[PDB]
Design a binder for this molecule. Structure first.
Ligand SMILES: N[C@@H](Cc1ccc(OS(=O)(=O)O)cc1)C(=O)O
Ligand SMILES: N[C@@H](Cc1ccc(OS(=O)(=O)O)cc1)C(=O)O
Ligand code: NA
Ligand code: NA
Ligand code: NA
Ligand code: NA
Lengths: 318, 318
């Protein structure tokens, strides 16, 4: 039972219909997806858990689809953000799309038969779409009354000076239509993402039902939190990037070594492919050894090799 | 003084900046406009006051633009409407545009040189506009906080069974953008409409300042009411259409004959080109004649010939 195996790692925040999805996974291979927006020229550790979950699903014989947000990255996801995102130029967004497309590739298998990974660009869903087609064919299905109650944007709708553009208010419709398109064109039945994406995923489930009368599912992975409540995934006052030109393999490895004892066994479950039994045995050995814990060393080795391969790991340890 | 003379006839509900507009009108001819949506294959009495005001401005030496809503008729204006409207198909709206254009034409002079009327179709503003272009270049200028506080829609935002689609919520941006386009393409500085259009007009004034840094203006004409408080422009629970195949010249004429004494002298001011002093002298006549009022007769004769021509007036009396 794949959902139960992910639950043992703490990797399931919410599922739209856990029993129906478990029955669907049990029937054999499905196609699933996760989206990644070009907000920078690199993904960071906030993208890593869902990216590794695509690989976990592919290991269980499902077909992962990585969607790069050519269209959505021109709009900006307001979900649980206090302030409007910078509107980037088309030329800048296109350059970041290509960089992010190359970055996701190593995490998935593009050559393993029927469940080979697919990469898609949601620009394909909107590049030929007239404004009037969007507002009518998609917009008619969205209740503004329901949109203003989505937890993801509620904080933006108190004060006008802390408010939201029509631009970012529309984002929910774009990711909603993206699910309907991936279902109709690619046979995708599951979207995963961080818990912040719950409301964008359920809009897609509801819109796919409205447009196509196909039944699809949502599953969210936790936002990564530390026992001490400080922000996860910052190094010397900036993001931990997956790009070694942005965060050196050395700085990446040192980030993992510096993990708190309270966080390290959870982080092994989130960020590595070590079995639950290996992680549980490491916890016990660290508890009943008397020496300083080695969990941090293992985590730094495992994740550094995953993101930067043996070459990056030797560069970090040189 | 034009605004002053319109006020004498009861034809001015609100002006956005009366002093700055009266100054512009005194300098020389301006271009102004009023929009009509293809909600049906005909205009009705709810359209007649805005249309006659377009005519009054032209007679005063200004250049009227009659905009038919080729794009906006595909979306639907929610302003002060209790309920979401039905969508029409593109092929139907196309047909209805051509019918409304033909209905509006006779009211304006397309053959008087400088101040010749223009027929415009807002489809041209959106026909080649991609959804992402709209959301970015127009949508970034709109605060959802300000939009949900517009009087025209705020009462659709209490309960979802009385709610509003993203489609109709978007209408205000399309009309806003229409003003900006007409400003840049034709030098239009004034939009007139029914009092229901105030918020649609002010979004176009604001958007025009943001896009073009030009000051433009709005003037609303009253929604016509009966002194008895009942709905104006309904005969037998239906609309009074300007199309003689929908509302016969006879029924149209009888609608005016059956005008309340408390409405007739006010309606002579709204709907005819008689002097105030002539209408006042007619009021005097009906006051102290002993006989039946002549005013409802004069109103029926004048408005039937204005709307249906001599042929219509002859058909009304048979
Ligand atoms: N909103 C996500 C990014 C994202 C991008 C594209 C997606 O694909 S679509 O086909 O559903 O649009 C989905 C999610 C974030 O901000 O992380
Ligand atoms: N909303 C108006 C109709 C309308 C139609 C077109 C207009 O032109 S535009 O260029 O501003 O779009 C303006 C107003 C009604 O419901 O009567
Ligand atoms: Na299962
Ligand atoms: Na944005
Ligand atoms: Na509508
Ligand atoms: Na308003």
């Amino acid at each position: 039972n794949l959902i139960k195996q992910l639950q043992e790692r703490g990797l399931v925040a919410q599922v739209t219909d856990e029993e129906a999805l478990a029955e669907r996974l049990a029937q054999g291979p499905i196609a699933l997806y996760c989206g990644f927006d070009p907000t920078a020229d690199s993904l960071h550790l906030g993208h890593l858990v869902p990216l590794l979950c695509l690989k976990r699903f592919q290991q269980a014989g499902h077909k992962p689809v990585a969607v790069v947000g050519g269209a959505t990255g021109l709009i900006g996801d307001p979900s649980f953000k206090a302030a409007e995102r910078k509107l980037n130029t088309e030329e800048t967004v296109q350059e970041w799309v290509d960089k992010i497309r190359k970055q996701v590739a190593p995490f998935l298998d593009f050559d393993c038969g029927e469940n080979s990974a697919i990469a898609a660009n949601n620009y394909d869903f909107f590049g030929n779409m007239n404004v009037l087609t969007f507002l009518r064919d998609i917009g008619k299905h969205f209740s503004v009354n329901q949109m203003i109650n989505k937890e993801a944007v509620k904080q933006r709708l108190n004060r006008e000076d802390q408010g939201i553009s029509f631009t970012e208010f529309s984002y929910n419709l774009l990711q909603g239509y993206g699910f309907a398109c991936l279902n109709k064109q690619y046979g995708v039945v599951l979207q995963i993402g961080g818990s912040d994406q719950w409301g964008n995923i359920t809009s897609g489930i509801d819109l796919t039902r409205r447009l196509h009368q196909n039944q699809v599912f949502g599953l969210t992975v936790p936002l990564i939190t530390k026992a001490d409540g400080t922000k996860f995934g910052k190094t010397e006052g900036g993001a931990v990037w997956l790009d070694p030109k942005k965060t050196s393999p050395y700085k990446f490895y040192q980030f993992w070594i510096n993990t708190a004892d309270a966080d390290v066994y959870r982080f092994l479950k989130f960020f590595t492919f070590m079995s639950i039994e290996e992680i549980n045995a490491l916890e016990e050995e660290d508890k009943n050894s008397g020496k300083a814990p080695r969990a941090q060393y293992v985590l730094a080795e495992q994740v550094t090799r995953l993101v930067h391969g043996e070459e990056g790991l030797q560069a970090a340890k040189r």
